[PDB]
Design a protein around this ligand. Sequence first.
Ligand SMILES: Cc1ccc(C(=O)N[C@@H](Cc2ccccc2)[C@H](O)CN(CC(C)C)S(=O)(=O)c2ccc(N)cc2)cc1Nc1nccc(-c2cccnc2)n1
Ligand SMILES: [Cl-]
Ligand SMILES: [Cl-]
Ligand SMILES: [Cl-]
Ligand SMILES: [Cl-]
Ligand code: NA
Ligand code: NA
Lengths: 99, 99
Amino acid sequence: PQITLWKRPLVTIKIGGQLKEALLDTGADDTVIEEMSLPGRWKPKMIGGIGGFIKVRQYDQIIIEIAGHKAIGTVLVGPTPVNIIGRNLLTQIGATLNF
Amino acid sequence: PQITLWKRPLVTIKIGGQLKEALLDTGADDTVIEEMSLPGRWKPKMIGGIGGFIKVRQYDQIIIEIAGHKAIGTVLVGPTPVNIIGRNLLTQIGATLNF
Ligand SMILES: Cc1ccc(C(=O)N[C@@H](Cc2ccccc2)[C@H](O)CN(CC(C)C)S(=O)(=O)c2ccc(N)cc2)cc1Nc1nccc(-c2cccnc2)n1
Ligand SMILES: [Cl-]
Ligand SMILES: [Cl-]
Ligand SMILES: [Cl-]
Ligand SMILES: [Cl-]
Ligand code: NA
Ligand code: NA
């Protein structure tokens, strides 16, 4: 698809058996999801941006279906105000910015 | 161009005759730049990021070139970690997300 930017680029994802709405975010290095359980090992991480830092749990090798496209990678879980699909998974679905 | 997302989507911008680096950020509603001098009056704005909110200065109808594409629009100035080109100006340069 071609997604214009007149509105926020929100899509449906499936993660950990759950459907969520998430922002396709070229400004985010990694994917960050609101609090949920995921299986397997994790380790703590701090991530920063406008307004400072939050503590998250880093889960590696997590499968996510993004607008119907499967990808695997790291998912950070923590108190993000918005679910964000970052570059680490945008690359895997072949997302590009075009102008 | 067609910009892939394996690296941060950094471009050169020009504002007030000065070249700066900025991130093309589909997850940002609005363009936010680090402290600089801009002409004219400003209005207050609160924006919300990953870590909470920052107060910024809103300057309207500012001339800005983005990766060689001319825009005129709103620029927010405040303590952002990186200069970010948000959707308000990504639409002016005709940017879409594609996969
Ligand atoms: C005006 C404005 C300026 C900058 C930003 C912004 O910092 N965007 C964030 C994403 C975001 C969006 C909304 C809330 C928190 C985080 C940006 O795209 C990515 N950030 C990095 C950039 C600042 C360099 S980030 O979120 O800090 C970040 C850092 C590390 C990682 N791994 C992932 C994300 C957002 C807005 N506002 C905005 N933009 C998009 C959606 C909403 C929103 C959504 C729901 C309800 N209300 C507002 N609000
Ligand atoms: Cl990854
Ligand atoms: Cl590629
Ligand atoms: Cl905001
Ligand atoms: Cl604008
Ligand atoms: Na894992
Ligand atoms: Na103005």
